[PDB]
Design a protein around this ligand. Structure first.
Ligand code: NAP
Ligand code: NCA
Ligand code: NA
Lengths: 230, 230
């Protein structure tokens, strides 16, 4: 079943790493970015993979994102749908200072928009496919690591909650629903202290995604496919 | 020996029931509401309890809320602080339709503002006291029951996250941190429409709050003081 892979937010970082790693496995990759032409990484993947990498212009916060993606896919089904795009929220991560506009941006971008998009595309997802949302270990209540970055963590707890609630709408899950912790990865957000490379993270995430295909389960797992507690 | 109990959001519903229940125990209650004079319930409690119920105008979303509360308390320490923020969010509970203003209102009211207020008042809380936030069963990832009300549920998962993040800022808790599920006073089952009275819910929550005094723990509990999973 691993034919058509859609990565939402693929210009750089983990998302670009995912596009690369799925291409290396022989997938047909639809790589959505806000400004694809401005991504040297995606341009380098297009050079290498040719027509197996299709760059798609799109924006997770735009309500026409699913329609653009569908117009582009035509009748093609999505085997693996990965929502990767995200933000951090205010740099000081201070619940005492975040304002209304920041709050709306943070919870729309990191929690609501992923569900809106995935839901809008869900009828095009192959039965037995995988819909995966990049989450974080900061979303875990039990781990309690969200002190490190409380606003980001809360946004990802909200994401996890909305994915569990979507699961609850189905009498029988038609695809898997994954919440993925990529590890702490050297990206613009992750910074120089992050212990994992994008390449290591993405390799593992690809395996976790593939391990859920055909299982129709909801899992919160890391890049080693190890379960994280809620 | 009369404890000082501050209830933020006390004009109706469980907030009003908590004020009533604490008054019946002999506490000094400060009952904060947006428009106290327009609450017949609070007016009836003021009439019955006299000075032991102080109905205070205040709004968790206003940037002077903590300041006004403090000016009003003077040097009185807060033995029990109960934040009964809560709005449902958009009635359709639809990620495809929620806009920026609604998103800000939902996550500020239900998650961010409660923490902002509690944190600002923290130094006035009695050591060995209790700070409690009204959460919900719908916040629980493990239960996963929030399909009917996904946005409300996600807003309360965000609350639980932010409370856990605050917990992690302390080497040892100076007071308990509770997340409360009040139960369902009304259900969508016609043959089981009213399984719990507000007065029983409030009485139960008071017992749960009192059970945490002096424990200095973080607990997610219902009105029977049963633990809910995260
Ligand atoms: N790095 C880590 O250590 C780490 C740890 C835990 C979880 N995560 C999660 O893993 C995901 C990827 O993390 P990351 O560090 O590689 O990158 P990120 O900073 O979270 O996201 C950056 C990528 O998202 C795109 N993006 C942002 N907003 C977008 C929008 N409205 N529409 C379309 N694309 C948008 C960006 O494209 P532009 O080039 O156009 O900006 C970029 O490709 C995120 O969900 C993040 O929360 C990362
Ligand atoms: N989940 C993580 O460890 C994380 C999230 C965002 C930035 N850095 C690390
Ligand atoms: Na990056």
């Amino acid at each position: 079943s691993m034919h058509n892979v859609l990565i939402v937010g693929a210009s750089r970082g983990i998302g670009l790493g995912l596009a690369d790693a799925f291409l290396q496995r022989g997938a047909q990759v639809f790589a959505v970015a806000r400004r694809p032409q401005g991504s040297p990484g995606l341009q380098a993947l297009a050079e290498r993979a040719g027509e197996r990498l299709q760059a798609v212009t799109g924006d997770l916060n735009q309500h026409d994102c699913a329609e653009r993606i569908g117009e582009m896919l035509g009748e093609r089904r999505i085997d693996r749908l990965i929502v990767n795009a995200g933000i951090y929220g205010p740099q000081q991560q201070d619940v005492a200072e975040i304002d209304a506009e920041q709050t709306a941006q943070l919870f729309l971008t990191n929690a609501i928009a992923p569900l809106r998009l995935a839901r809008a595309l869900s009828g095009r997802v192959s039965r037995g496919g995988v819909v995966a949302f990049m989450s974080s270990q900061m979303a875990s209540l039990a781990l309690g690591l969200s002190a490190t970055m409380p606003l980001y963590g809360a946004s990802k707890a909200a994401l996890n909650s909305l994915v569990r609630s979507w699961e609850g709408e189905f009498e029988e899950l038609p695809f898997s629903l994954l919440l993925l912790h990529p590890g702490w990865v050297r990206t613009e957000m992750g910074g120089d202290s992050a212990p994992l490379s994008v390449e290591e993270s993405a390799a593992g995430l690809v395996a976790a995604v593939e391990d859920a295909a055909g299982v129709n389960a909801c899992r919160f797992v890391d890049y080693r496919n190890q379960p994280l507690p809620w």
